[PDB]
Amino acid sequence: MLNRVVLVGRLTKDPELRSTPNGVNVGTFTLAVNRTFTNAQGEREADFINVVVFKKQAENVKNYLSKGSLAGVDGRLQTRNYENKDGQRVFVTEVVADSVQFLEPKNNNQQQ
Amino acid sequence: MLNRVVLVGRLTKDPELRSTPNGVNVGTFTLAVNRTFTNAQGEREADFINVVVFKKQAENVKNYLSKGSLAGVDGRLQTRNYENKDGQRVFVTEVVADSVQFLEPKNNNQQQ
Amino acid sequence: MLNRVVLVGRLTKDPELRSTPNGVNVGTFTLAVNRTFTNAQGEREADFINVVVFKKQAENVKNYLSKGSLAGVDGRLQTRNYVFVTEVVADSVQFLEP
Amino acid sequence: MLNRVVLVGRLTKDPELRSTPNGVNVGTFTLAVNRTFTNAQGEREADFINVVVFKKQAENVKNYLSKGSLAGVDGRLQTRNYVFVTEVVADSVQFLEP
Numbered sequence A, B: 001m002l003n004r005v006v007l008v009g010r011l012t013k014d015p016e017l018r019s020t021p022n023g024v025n026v027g028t029f030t031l032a033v034n035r036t037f038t039n040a041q042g043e044r045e046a047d048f049i050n051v052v053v054f055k056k057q058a059e060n061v062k063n064y065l066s067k068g069s070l071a072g073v074d075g076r077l078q079t080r081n082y083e084n085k086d087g088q089r090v091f092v093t094e095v096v097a098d099s100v101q102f103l104e105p106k107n108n109n110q111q112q
Numbered sequence C, D: 001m002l003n004r005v006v007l008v009g010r011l012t013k014d015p016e017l018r019s020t021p022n023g024v025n026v027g028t029f030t031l032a033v034n035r036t037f038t039n040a041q042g043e044r045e046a047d048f049i050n051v052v053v054f055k056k057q058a059e060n061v062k063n064y065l066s067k068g069s070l071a072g073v074d075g076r077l078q079t080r081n082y083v084f085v086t087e088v089v090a091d092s093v094q095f096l097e098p
């Protein structure tokens, strides 16, 4: 069934890259996306989307993407449930990126 | 900034419609979206997206949408943080629908 | 760069199916997409989008999709030339009717 | 019915700005959208999409957007006629450069 997400935002931290003994690399980062419908002084808010990326895309994210860089994301919305180390159920909604595009560096509105 | 979600899935329960004394109606429902990339016998999984709808769209959802109906959704991805009644922080990612389209009823693959 | 199109409409005619000299199936159809909001006059307009789909999905388009069938399409917007033509290249198609 | 297009590309020429006899500003520009994946030969192709934007957004397109400027576009796919023309009608435009 149809499931498509497109985002443009800025990374809040530098991307992390973990791995499982199953041998696959899993990159994660948070995308801060300012709301367009409230972009005006006195009411600018952002949403913070969790993006997850795997395999090849995941390493090109760790190399070339840094905290504060503008990135575009294209993917699916997916949900998980796990148990944290305390025994509480955790429900997650993340964007699984099919492609991540590097748009602008960290400080492009003062450097340009 | 760009933020677009498009979904087609089936409702897991009947939509709920709450209200605040601020006088605005807030409709909510969960959309179950089968993954396209695993649609085959032996590996069909779905993701369960929380959709939120307001004002007029929200009532036309409660009238005309029921558990098991196929619905299409178009909107933004948004995040909230609140405190539940126990004092734990709760982080939510939901789809805020701009439009909700009614596609097929509950039992359309046996009635058609 | 990002390029994504998502559509839901009905086919105007029956899906067509050709092949490439490389042996790849090329399914085509036109989708009538009603506008969700009416226009200044109140009438409902539809747009007529040309969709293209490849390989085995194109065969399932030919088998299970007919004139008037409701379909969802997910893909890219691409431009071709001779007369400039724009079509949606579907990587995914969803069959909303049996 | 659902109809959504999202694009990121660069303008091929300078944005144009006309008006309707009803007094609404109509901004137009062409966006060159590079394909993310290369083709069977390995070359990178771009698509050239016609974008249309209205009212005050069209004015901010004329002020702040120039040939070669990077822009994001969010809107509908619509079809017009005389020669069949398909354009993206932008409800939102994002300026990726100052």
Ligand SMILES: O=c1[nH]cc(F)c(=O)[nH]1
Pocket (backbone or CB within 6 Å): C012, C013, C030, C048
């Ligand atoms: O009714 C139609 N209008 C336009 C078309 F391209 C088509 O196939 N059918």
Ligand SMILES: O=c1[nH]cc(F)c(=O)[nH]1
Pocket (backbone or CB within 6 Å): D012, D013, D030, D048
């Ligand atoms: O280089 C270009 N190709 C096609 C176009 F429509 C255009 O404006 N520019």
